[PDB]
Amino acid sequence: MERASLIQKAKLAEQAERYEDMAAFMKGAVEKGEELSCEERNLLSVAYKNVVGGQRAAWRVLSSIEQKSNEEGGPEVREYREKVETELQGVCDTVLGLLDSHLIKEAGDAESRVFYLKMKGDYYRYLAEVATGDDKKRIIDSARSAYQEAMDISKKEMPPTNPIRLGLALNFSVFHYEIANSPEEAISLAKTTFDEAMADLHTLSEDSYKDSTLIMQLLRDNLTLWT
Amino acid sequence: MERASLIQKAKLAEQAERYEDMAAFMKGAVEKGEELSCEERNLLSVAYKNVVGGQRAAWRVLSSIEQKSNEEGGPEVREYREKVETELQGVCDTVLGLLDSHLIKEAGDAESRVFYLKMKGDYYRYLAEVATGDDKKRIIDSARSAYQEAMDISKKEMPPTNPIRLGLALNFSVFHYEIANSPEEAISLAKTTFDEAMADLHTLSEDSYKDSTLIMQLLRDNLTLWT
Amino acid sequence: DRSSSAPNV
Amino acid sequence: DRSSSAPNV
Ligand SMILES: [Cl-]
Ligand SMILES: [Cl-]
Ligand SMILES: [Cl-]
Ligand SMILES: [Cl-]
Ligand SMILES: [Mg+2]
Ligand SMILES: [Mg+2]
Where are the Phosphoserine residues found in this chain (chains C, D)? Predict the structure, then answer.
């Protein structure tokens, strides 16, 4: 129906904590083919991240049990893990479909482009977490490509403390460590990102500082974990 | 499929926080027509309460917005409130269907019977929260009848500090206040329940005491609210 | 405020 | 433990 009605319903869904509905409303809004505002981008991202987040958490619980049994001591665990996986792949595919059909090519500015390319890398990363065989290889390649393009734009267009730039770098470092099994690249990126941002914090207002250091603390937390 | 496989999958669902799935598995298990153990009763109750809980929370958010607009200053809010309501009614109807088709008549002991009759009263109460007209009247009558039968059994078969008995009395008092608009009956029941239980707390072990006083505190909290 | 009802574990 | 990624508001 009308785009404005879909946005209204997405915001109602959000207040109601109805994230599947929220995502479906935002999908309909994207499909109108107009750009999304900052607010609207965030509605889309929050909705789908809540949906995939539930599936990822469930998949991890089930995969852990499944792995713990395929050592020593029915098909139920496997079967249910497979069901949740298929669901997760469907949601990731839907998001990537929106990004490739509409959002990336229609974005009118640098910030939007980085936002959507990062999302592209993230949803490939979530696919990579559950993938095997040839699927996993092609997914990993796709994630790296998306993240790297986003990184190139962000380095040209955004200051080092910019929260979008910081969050992209954080997630790409997670990719390197968890997905690509490149711990050295992970640490290198996280440390460089942190150091180049620390350099500029003394120039920031209270609110800017809070937004930047939220992400910077996560880079730090990962560095502790990874060393 | 096999009953044991359904129970296994319900417990996996629970660990995964997949409550819709959990409820569907427990529905299949009930439909095998054997009694549920204490553990299994609790799987069923947790699953469906999580599902209806999400819908109730959403309905309340939406109904509040809808009401706040039908004073001074599109159909979207109403339409979405109606969608969520229809969903909620479907879940409540499914639970009541299980209770009437299987659980109440097949229960082999007093505790089971009270548990299921209380559930019957609860799901009618959730229906009553969203009902209007003739539907609301018949639902309210049905809730009262179920609660009252449960109360009669619990008074004969359970001590005053029994957590099931206490929880039933709590929920029936909520019915009186919120649904029946009988504040005097609500207060009277809550106060009597509390006083008759307090009488016996000095006889309880640490663990029994904790289980009983959890519910007793809620009766107290309601009494504060209602006076 | 809404009244409290019995919790589930 | 799993690495932390960027939060959503
Ligand atoms: Cl329009
Ligand atoms: Cl399954
Ligand atoms: Cl069997
Ligand atoms: Cl709707
Ligand atoms: Mg699969
Ligand atoms: Mg209705």
Answer: 5
